[PDB]
Amino acid sequence: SNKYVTAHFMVGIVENYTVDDWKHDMELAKETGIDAFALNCASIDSYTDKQLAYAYEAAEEVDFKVFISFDFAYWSNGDTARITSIMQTYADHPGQFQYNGAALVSTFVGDSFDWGPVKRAVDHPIFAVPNLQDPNWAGHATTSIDGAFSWYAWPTDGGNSIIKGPMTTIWDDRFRNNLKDKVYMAPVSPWFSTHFNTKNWVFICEDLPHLRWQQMLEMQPELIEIISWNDYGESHYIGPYSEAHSDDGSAQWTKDFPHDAWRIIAKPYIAAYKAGEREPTVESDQLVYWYRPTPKAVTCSKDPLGPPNGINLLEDSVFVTTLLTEPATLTVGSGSLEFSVDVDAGIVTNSFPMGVGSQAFSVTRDGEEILGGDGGLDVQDRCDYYNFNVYVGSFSA
Ligand SMILES: OC[C@H]1O[C@H](O)[C@H](O)[C@@H](O)[C@@H]1O
Ligand SMILES: OC[C@H]1O[C@H](O)[C@H](O)[C@@H](O)[C@@H]1O
């Protein structure tokens, strides 16, 4: 009956992590109210066993928890013996995240992997919540599951066209209807932008870094997984940009693009979600802002990859989430443009037309500025490469 929030962590990019690197990520996750990392890992990485051992040790040492996400883009159904041996190592580890007295285990893809032989070979109870693609098959799953994890974190109609938002709960409600008694782990992602030779698209997210958390308070799923802590290559990271991870080419659009301020939004929503509350509690005045580096129609000078699929559906907007103890007035300067809007107490998002140039934010109450400053990135009217990630920043009273 207790509710918990987890975050997807890419073990595949941390070959060179130390225990101290893991501890740093875990401390930041704890400060946000996250309960555990899903350690997404691959059979093909020679460093998987080493880094799982470091993560479980770090979690035990800093009062955090972890569980394994077997990434079945790499793991295979023929790996049952190795998966079993890993669960024999970790299901009863004090740092292993437990749900209802059983060790949580999950996947990326891997719908066809049968958990029966694993569960029946491990003495400690296991709670299997794999990533499943079809809500209806989740209803009659043959693989000995205890719940399902959805990857439908972004607007989609089920096909391969990119569709406009705003995000809806249509897929969440389909999973929940089919799961009945079983548990549902809902995905929470702030953004999506990827730009590789093998994957080059955006999803239409916009106000998603706030809106999705509001949906979580409405929906009250049994578990949440944040997509993601550190998948720089898909731009949905809410964790820090770690110096020790291995760059895959995503540094091009991520190294200068902090996302840490999105944790300011997540923190009160996580507390409210765990408490069963329908609205967050604001403890101090804060502001979180985000925006892309250029207007969407700018043509690049030299990108060997074309523009990402879907960009025409984006808006040229600056997004601002205010976290307010009392009503106030929000003023935004975006290039030569200036806007203002009265905002209620609570957590509210407003979008503003993007202008090229410097960005400025200010919140005033009773004719006095309570917070404000300059955006950390000037919006530009040209680019070498297409970057549809966002810069995120904050101001706190
Ligand atoms: O974790 C599996 C694989 O994930 C990603 O493709 C990484 O770029 C690669 O280095 C890793 O082997
Ligand atoms: O829907 C987003 C997902 O699309 C594809 O399945 C990609 O393989 C995966 O990496 C991405 O997260």
Residue numbers in the entry: 35 to 431
Paper lines:
To increase our understanding of GH71, we have performed a phylogenetic analysis of the family and detailed biochemical analysis of two of the five GH71 enzymes encoded by Aspergillus nidulans (AnGH71B and -C). We present the first structure of a GH71 protein, AnGH71C, including structures with carbohydrate ligands.
Complexes of AnGH71C with glucose and nigerotriose/nigerotetraose were obtained by soaking crystals with ligand and clearly revealed the binding cleft within the N-terminal (β/α)8-barrel domain.
